Amino acid sequence: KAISLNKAGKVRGQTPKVEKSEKEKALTGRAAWRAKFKRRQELFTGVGKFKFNKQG
RNA sequence: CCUUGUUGCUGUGAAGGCUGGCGAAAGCCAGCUGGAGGCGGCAAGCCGUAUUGAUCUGCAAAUCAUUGGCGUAAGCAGGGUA
RNA sequence: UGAACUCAUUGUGACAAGGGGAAUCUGACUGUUUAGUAAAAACAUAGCUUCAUGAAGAGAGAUGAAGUGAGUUCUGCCCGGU
RNA sequence: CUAUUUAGACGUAGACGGGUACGGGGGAUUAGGGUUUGAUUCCGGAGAGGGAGCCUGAGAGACGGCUACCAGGUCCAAGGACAGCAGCAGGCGCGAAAAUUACCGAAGCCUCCAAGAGGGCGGUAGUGAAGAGACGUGAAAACAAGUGUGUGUAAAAACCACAUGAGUAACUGGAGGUCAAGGCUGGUGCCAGCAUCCGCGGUAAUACCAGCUCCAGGAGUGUCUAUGAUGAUUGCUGCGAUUAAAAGGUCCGUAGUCGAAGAACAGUACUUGUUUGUAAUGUGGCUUAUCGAGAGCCGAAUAGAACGAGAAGAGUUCAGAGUAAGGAGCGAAGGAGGGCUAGAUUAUUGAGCAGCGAGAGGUGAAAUUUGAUGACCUGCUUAGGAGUAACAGAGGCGAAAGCGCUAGUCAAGAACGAAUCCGAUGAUCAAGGACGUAGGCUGGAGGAUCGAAGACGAUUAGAGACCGUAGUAGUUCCAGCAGUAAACGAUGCCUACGCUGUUGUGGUUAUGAGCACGGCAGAAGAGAAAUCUAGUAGGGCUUUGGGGAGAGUACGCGCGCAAGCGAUAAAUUUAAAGGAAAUUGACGGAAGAACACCACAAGGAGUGGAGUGUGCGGCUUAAUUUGACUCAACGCGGGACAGCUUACCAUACCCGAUGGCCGUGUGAGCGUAGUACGCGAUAGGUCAGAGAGUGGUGCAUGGCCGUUAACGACGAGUGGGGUGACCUUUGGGUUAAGUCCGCGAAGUAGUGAGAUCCCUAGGAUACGAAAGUUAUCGACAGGUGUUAAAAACACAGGAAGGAAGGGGCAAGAACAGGUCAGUGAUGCCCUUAGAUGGUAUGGGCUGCACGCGCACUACAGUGGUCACAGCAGAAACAAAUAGAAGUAAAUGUGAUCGAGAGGGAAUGAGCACUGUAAUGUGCACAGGAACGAGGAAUUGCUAGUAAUCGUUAUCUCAUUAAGAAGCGAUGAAUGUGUCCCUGUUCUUUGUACACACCGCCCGUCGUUAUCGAAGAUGGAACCAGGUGCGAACAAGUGAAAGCGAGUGAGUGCAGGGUUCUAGAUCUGAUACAAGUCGUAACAAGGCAGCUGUAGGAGAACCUGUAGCUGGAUCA
Ligand SMILES: [K+]
Ligand SMILES: [K+]
Ligand SMILES: [K+]
Ligand SMILES: [K+]
Ligand SMILES: [K+]
Ligand SMILES: [K+]
Ligand SMILES: [K+]
Ligand SMILES: [K+]
Ligand SMILES: [K+]
Ligand SMILES: [K+]
Ligand SMILES: [K+]
Ligand SMILES: [K+]
Ligand SMILES: [K+]
Ligand SMILES: [K+]
Ligand SMILES: [K+]
Ligand SMILES: [K+]
Ligand SMILES: [K+]
Ligand SMILES: [K+]
Ligand SMILES: [K+]
Ligand SMILES: [K+]
Ligand SMILES: [K+]
Ligand SMILES: [K+]
Ligand SMILES: [K+]
Ligand SMILES: [K+]
Ligand SMILES: [K+]
Ligand SMILES: [K+]
Ligand SMILES: [K+]
Ligand SMILES: [K+]
Ligand SMILES: [K+]
Ligand SMILES: [K+]
Ligand SMILES: [K+]
Ligand SMILES: [K+]
Ligand SMILES: [K+]
Ligand SMILES: [K+]
Ligand SMILES: [K+]
Ligand SMILES: [K+]
Ligand SMILES: [K+]
Ligand SMILES: [K+]
Ligand SMILES: [K+]
Ligand SMILES: [K+]
Ligand SMILES: [K+]
Ligand SMILES: [Mg+2]
Ligand SMILES: [Mg+2]
Ligand SMILES: [Mg+2]
Ligand SMILES: [Mg+2]
Ligand SMILES: [Mg+2]
Ligand SMILES: [Mg+2]
Ligand SMILES: [Mg+2]
Ligand SMILES: [Mg+2]
Ligand SMILES: [Mg+2]
Ligand SMILES: [Mg+2]
Ligand SMILES: [Mg+2]
Ligand SMILES: [Mg+2]
Ligand SMILES: [Mg+2]
Ligand SMILES: [Mg+2]
Ligand SMILES: [Mg+2]
Ligand SMILES: [Mg+2]
Ligand SMILES: [Mg+2]
Ligand SMILES: [Mg+2]
Ligand SMILES: [Mg+2]
Ligand SMILES: [Mg+2]
Ligand SMILES: [Mg+2]
Ligand SMILES: [Mg+2]
Ligand SMILES: [Mg+2]
Ligand SMILES: [Mg+2]
Ligand SMILES: [Mg+2]
Ligand SMILES: [Mg+2]
Ligand SMILES: [Mg+2]
Ligand SMILES: [Mg+2]
Ligand SMILES: [Mg+2]
Ligand SMILES: [Mg+2]
Ligand SMILES: [Mg+2]
Ligand SMILES: [Mg+2]
Ligand SMILES: [Mg+2]
Ligand SMILES: [Mg+2]
Ligand SMILES: [Mg+2]
Ligand SMILES: [Mg+2]
Ligand SMILES: [Mg+2]
Ligand SMILES: [Mg+2]
Ligand SMILES: [Mg+2]
Ligand SMILES: [Mg+2]
Ligand SMILES: [Mg+2]
Ligand SMILES: [Mg+2]
Ligand SMILES: [Mg+2]
Ligand SMILES: [Mg+2]
Ligand SMILES: [Mg+2]
Ligand SMILES: [Mg+2]
Ligand SMILES: [Mg+2]
Ligand SMILES: [Mg+2]
Ligand SMILES: [Mg+2]
Asked: Residue A2 CA to D1079 C1' — how many Å?
């Protein structure tokens, strides 16, 4: 029974190209760690609930 | 059917037997002894495959040469008898 | 059974004396046959199966008649015609 | 090595052959016990393209020495010459795979005749994210990498010191679960892709492709491939074998592994001391480079060996010792244990004869078939070959397979009783040996009954099968071969420790009990449960399993006359497996109760046939708008359409929340007999954004309906049982109903049923003066008779008698059941001034070859026609001269008509009514079609019911009922039952079904792919041997010429041993979305299934014979 290869690549053609927006140089090493440690202060409490990423 | 004549040389090595080893048994493996067979190679013989050889006014109204088949046997043969 | 020495072509010196292998058709084997154009795959053979009979100077492990052809493995269906 | 003598040497504790390998010190992982690796700094071995010979030397069978062959090369003047990178750089190939044709009088060492010469050995840098350390990528005031001097070295560079500039510096994999971190926004719609595994995507994708935010590790992070761990899935420590994979059919037996008490003895294992035995690595430490790997120094150490010591266990011996260890023997007794000899009561067939005179046989029902040549049945005679009924059992015997009449005879064994004898003789078992139901095979005897194969008769779409008739090999015996069974209690053999009650068999007994061999019922433990040959446990020895498939198959080998049997692989494929036990449902051509005119029995009226009314399909058309399809679509959508309804078709006309921007009284736009007049913000254009739609999707919904079902079920709290999913427990009587009565590991309250409510039947003491109305009352199986309870019936009184009759309301759970065309109920998609929005005039919804559903008039005389009466539910009715809506009709009496004067279909010219419009309705005259009681089928109905007969001040409605929803008149037949059919509930039981029987599933045939066997004839390599021939070198002998043992490379010719590969054709397996023919298995799966063996057959499979329950029976 018939088979064909006519459709290879389709979705990569049809998805509209969007440009990457600019951003700062991010931290690295201990610098990144001081930044994370201040954000997560709630979580280091044994009560209440932190949430890393929410879209509401 | 009755009475008789006619087996020389060699190869292979069945049944039965004795020793030695192995095995708990049953019975297996060596070496030797023994000498069976419409069994192998030949002799005397009996036969008749090939050369489509010789001969075809013959040696001969069926022979001759070389080459072949069997040859310890449902083998070959004289006389008497049906 | 060994070893050495020896020869100018080498030694079963003349005579006597197997060519061998791979396959197929066919008949099991040794044996027999068209005397005088056919030796064969034809005939025979051991084994297998069928048939008829209580009659004998013979008595069913007997006496005669047919067919197939050693061994191994198989041998299906039909009694309408004769 | 050679001469003569002796036959040895080595093997199941694995010889010999073949395959494979540099060996250790050490490395990786690791709680412990282990599993894997070692070309690779140290030690020892071998080699220098492949083989072989050799001179020199203290030392080589040397190759940066020589000589010859074989395979390859280089230069030439063609005559000859030279050469070997598994040294250091370097090049080409091969591969998925690995650096510079660099500097060196310095460090560590080696070589010479040396106050010096040589060394790619060694050292120094360059190159590369194989591995291992320490740190950058900012701080809150103030941060690498640069540069210059000095150092450093053999010379350098880097490193370090001081001094100058300054302000540079993160990526890889992910975000549904395992597994840390987004239902975010846009594309795509089972596509494209993602995903180790599970799984995503069919237009609402937290999983694809991208954007944006998060997470993890970080100068690093992902992937592929080997291995160690995970893993008690290789089990010494430490798994399993009743049913999941797994105890050999039973004995004997060698090698092997394992073996009393008592008294003594000896030291080789065993354990331990002292001394040896380890550079590096590793282990326990300390000291110096800024720190940390690194470097330097210290201490102890494995296996192996030398010499002493201790004697528990192991070992050796002894007999004034004699196992609930074995063998020999004695006494009395028991048993379908075995071989042989001689007898037996019946039965089934066959023949003979006698009696009788028509059928026998066989089945669910029948046919083949046999009988007047006398069957069948009843007598008497006989001839054979099998078998031992009832007694006969959770009884006995045997190693298992197996063994059942009575006597006599011949060997051996088990158990019991007891002061007999010998003394370790024993347990288990590869190899080897003996037995083994049935069916089968080789030869003989025989042949009653039964019966594979083969042949018929039936049944079926077809039966080749099941059933019946018949019939052969076999089924019996003797002498052998064979070697399998669901050969099963699916539970190896010895030996232990272990609770109670009861019942057997054989001996013995102080009569209390024991010993051997059993059955049964609990308990406690155990186990995933079911259950227990399964409890406790490092006792000994053998067999044996490691996810499904392929496969107990291929090749080789051993046995067999054959049939075959024993023993046993790879390639390939796949996420689970009709794997195990239990639980809840669904189903059964399973069992037992119930129930019901949408079930039947007993009956009564029809429908299906004709003509017409109406709906549905099909076809036609400009359009014939559309939903709905077993009950539960089809006079249904309140669907009786002239307009409207109306969604469809033809033509024509009409319109637009708000906000921004722009443009406007010097006039946006509008009317017109459209160009110059009238009216003026109202209604302009463009972007956003509303709203509207009988447009789409009920598989995006709400609400409401229908159906299960009008059925008996339905959940909560507390207690009980089970590891759990889950069950609340024994199913006996009753009702319409888990409605109730009994009884219980359960008990208490509720929903559903009943009660209540509404109508119909009886009832003033109230109200009225009109004569009726309404009514808190009346019936409860209450009374009698039926001897548990709950109940039921038969009588009797009573207006009314067993839910008084009829309605209405009416659990939980469900269904992708219906409706978006009821809705200012509604999500999302679509259209929106040339509209899918309104309006108007017309046309269609009503078209007609034809198949269906439901109704209405009929087929006459139990009728038709004329007239006359006369009666409902109660109360409504201008007028009308042929006739043109209305207050019953069947019916009662008299006439008439007389067997198509029954019947009114298609149609003619008229006469009126409703209406905006006839196409709709009424009336009169003509006309007079089929139909003479309906094939296969099919629908309701138990009493004021069915059927008959009219009527609606009920609904539709201007006009239209042959439709519904009511209402009254006349009024039966038969039963008062049953579970046979059709279904529905409950309880038991089986299951390979859960998507739930419309389920699931087996095998041929045909088509594709992929991997493997065989096969006439063949190719390659690569090893060792056997024969030829023989280059180089050569001891010896010779003045010499020569001659030449021996060591041998190469090469002839035959063979073998290994590994690959070709091959016409045949034959397996696996995957085939769904092709063809049947339906073999799972329910008593429609003939209960399965194991062995033998025939047969399109194919699953069918048939004979013996066996098993894993069976549909613990009886
Ligand atoms: K001889
Ligand atoms: K001639
Ligand atoms: K002459
Ligand atoms: K010769
Ligand atoms: K000669
Ligand atoms: K012959
Ligand atoms: K002969
Ligand atoms: K001849
Ligand atoms: K014949
Ligand atoms: K013959
Ligand atoms: K034959
Ligand atoms: K015939
Ligand atoms: K005949
Ligand atoms: K020259
Ligand atoms: K070299
Ligand atoms: K090199
Ligand atoms: K590399
Ligand atoms: K350095
Ligand atoms: K990223
Ligand atoms: K993403
Ligand atoms: K999305
Ligand atoms: K395994
Ligand atoms: K073990
Ligand atoms: K066996
Ligand atoms: K004893
Ligand atoms: K006996
Ligand atoms: K037998
Ligand atoms: K048959
Ligand atoms: K037939
Ligand atoms: K039959
Ligand atoms: K029969
Ligand atoms: K036997
Ligand atoms: K045997
Ligand atoms: K077996
Ligand atoms: K027993
Ligand atoms: K078990
Ligand atoms: K085989
Ligand atoms: K009818
Ligand atoms: K209807
Ligand atoms: K609904
Ligand atoms: K069957
Ligand atoms: Mg002689
Ligand atoms: Mg002879
Ligand atoms: Mg002669
Ligand atoms: Mg002759
Ligand atoms: Mg001739
Ligand atoms: Mg042939
Ligand atoms: Mg001859
Ligand atoms: Mg002749
Ligand atoms: Mg001749
Ligand atoms: Mg012949
Ligand atoms: Mg023959
Ligand atoms: Mg035979
Ligand atoms: Mg010698
Ligand atoms: Mg090494
Ligand atoms: Mg060397
Ligand atoms: Mg050499
Ligand atoms: Mg060298
Ligand atoms: Mg070097
Ligand atoms: Mg998470
Ligand atoms: Mg993901
Ligand atoms: Mg296991
Ligand atoms: Mg099983
Ligand atoms: Mg099993
Ligand atoms: Mg077994
Ligand atoms: Mg340090
Ligand atoms: Mg001891
Ligand atoms: Mg008779
Ligand atoms: Mg008896
Ligand atoms: Mg005894
Ligand atoms: Mg037999
Ligand atoms: Mg055993
Ligand atoms: Mg397996
Ligand atoms: Mg086998
Ligand atoms: Mg009936
Ligand atoms: Mg009809
Ligand atoms: Mg129903
Ligand atoms: Mg209209
Ligand atoms: Mg409309
Ligand atoms: Mg609407
Ligand atoms: Mg629905
Ligand atoms: Mg009810
Ligand atoms: Mg109770
Ligand atoms: Mg009620
Ligand atoms: Mg639906
Ligand atoms: Mg219509
Ligand atoms: Mg009439
Ligand atoms: Mg209607
Ligand atoms: Mg079936
Ligand atoms: Mg069946």
From this structure: 34
